[PDB]
Amino acid sequence: MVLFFEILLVAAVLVITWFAVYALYRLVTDE
């Protein structure tokens, strides 16, 4: 039960980090 919410926390951190690096990647790539 608590495990569900710590799983949710790490999933949120992964989505946050992915979005940060993806925004920077789309900024620097020439397409």
Partner 1 sequence: PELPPVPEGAVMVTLKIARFNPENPDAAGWQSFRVPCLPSDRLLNLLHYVKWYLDGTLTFRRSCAHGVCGSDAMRINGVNRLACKVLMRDMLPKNPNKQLTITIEPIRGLPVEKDLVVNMEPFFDAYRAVKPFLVTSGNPPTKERIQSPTDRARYDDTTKCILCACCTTSCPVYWSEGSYFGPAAIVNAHRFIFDSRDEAAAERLDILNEVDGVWRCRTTFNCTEACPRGIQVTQAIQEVKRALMFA
Partner 2 sequence: TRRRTLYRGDPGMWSWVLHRITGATIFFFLFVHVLDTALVRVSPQAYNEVIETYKTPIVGLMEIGLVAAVLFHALNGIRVILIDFWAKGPRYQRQMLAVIAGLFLVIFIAAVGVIGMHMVERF
Ligand X SMILES: CCCCCCCCCCCCCCCCCC(=O)O[C@@H](COC(=O)CCCCCCCCCCCCCCC)COP(=O)(O)OCCN
Ligand Y SMILES: CCCCCCCCCCCCCCCCCC(=O)OC[C@H](COP(=O)([O-])OCC(O)COP(=O)([O-])OC[C@@H](COC(=O)CCCCCCCCCCCCCCCCC)OC(=O)CCCCCCCCCCCCCCCCC)OC(=O)CCCCCCCCCCCCCCCCC
* Residues 1-31, interacting with partner 2 (CB under 8 A): 1-2, 5-6, 8-9, 11-13, 15-16, 19-20, 23-24, 27-31
Task: List residues binding ligand PIE (CB under 6 A).
Answer: 11, 14-15, 17-18, 21-22, 25
**Distance in Å, CB of 28 to partner 1, minimum:** 10
Tokens coding 2: 């608590």
Between the alpha carbon of residue 21 and those of residues 8, 10, 26, 27, the distances in Å are 20, 17, 9, 10
Tokens 């992915």 sit at which residue?
A: 18
* Unique residue bearing structure tokens 């790490």: 10
Question: Is 30 near partner 1 (CB under 8 A)?
Answer: yes
